[PDB]
Symmetry: C2
């Protein structure tokens, strides 16, 4: 571990990361909500972004092994598309999930990494940290894991799901306001 070489092979890593982002943008694989932030981060000389994603809502079932996704959305969802996803449930535990946007950022030095973590935390991404895999991870706290059923049996009704959907979308909107806040302050990291 070298303080001035926080991310190993930074030049090459950034080159590869930019190439991967170009493809993602081309195919639309990139979550439009985080595009602005990704471009701003990569514009700063001492950073680059890798496998990242915007907030997302999902319906999935898992044994207790390898889960199966029944529905996946990267924006505010509607009641009926979630209902349709739930009707696909057949086995295991059925969960309705809300995930915060997550960004992985390479950094030239430890100082660069720490400054980014501190800035991200100040903008609402309280779970931002330095991850060992070293890389910076930016993540918020509005996560949700709602148990909806088990082994083909749904425990909740439509009105209940409508309430869960309303709350999930409120988190999605909160995520967006946070990305915008961070995006507007990230230029402060430029030297």
């Amino acid at each position: 571990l070298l303080y001035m070489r926080f991310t190993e092979n930074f030049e090459r890593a950034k080159k590869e990361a930019l190439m991967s982002l170009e493809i993602a943008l081309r195919k639309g694989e990139v979550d439009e909500d985080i595009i602005p932030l990704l471009k701003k981060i990569n514009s700063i000389e001492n950073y680059f972004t890798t496998s990242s994603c915007s907030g997302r809502i999902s319906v999935m079932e898992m044994p207790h092994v390898n889960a199966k996704w029944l529905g996946k959305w990267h924006r505010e969802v509607s009641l009926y598309e979630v209902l349709e996803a739930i009707k696909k449930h057949r086995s295991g535990q059925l969960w309705f999930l809300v995930r915060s946007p997550i960004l992985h950022v390479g950094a030239k030095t430890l100082e660069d990494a720490v400054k980014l973590v501190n800035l991200a935390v100040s903008c609402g991404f309280k779970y931002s940290n330095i991850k060992s895999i070293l890389i910076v991870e930016i993540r918020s706290t509005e996560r949700m894991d709602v148990l909806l059923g088990e082994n083909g049996e749904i425990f909740v009704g439509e009105e209940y799901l409508n309430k869960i959907v309303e709350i999930a979308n409120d988190q999605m909107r909160r995520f967006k306001e946070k990305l915008k806040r961070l995006e507007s302050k990230i230029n402060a990291l430029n030297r």
Copy 2:
């Protein structure tokens, strides 16, 4: 301005201070007894010390909106597995806001003497089932490693006094919650047994 290596220079002092805080918390019975053995073991290792931590919790609480932990009121708070009756008694106290049944992973905060020591601990914790472990902060006073697991639950039970669930759904919720808590406890014990590796 982060001062490189200052936390290492300040380690001896930071550990002494952390130990004084733990010593009193223990005497006053403020530490989740569940992980007292683990905390003592971590502090027994030369290059680490512990700061405020917890062993996992199941909660029945009401808050204005899902996102606002600042505004919450706990009707029921447990750091152990629970019975349906305990949960029902907490639910009976619901009167305002959204009522939620929550399950949260244990969270340990550990100071490390060097960046290398921090990484070694993070990797060990991850290997023990705490996938959300990482380096939370680096200041001139200390470097904090956070140890946390991924399991959790967030189930809406009612709103503004109205309850949305029945006993069979509640039974299923409590069943899963207890399964998660049991996993948390198992992982904490696994970590305690592997700490010596460091």
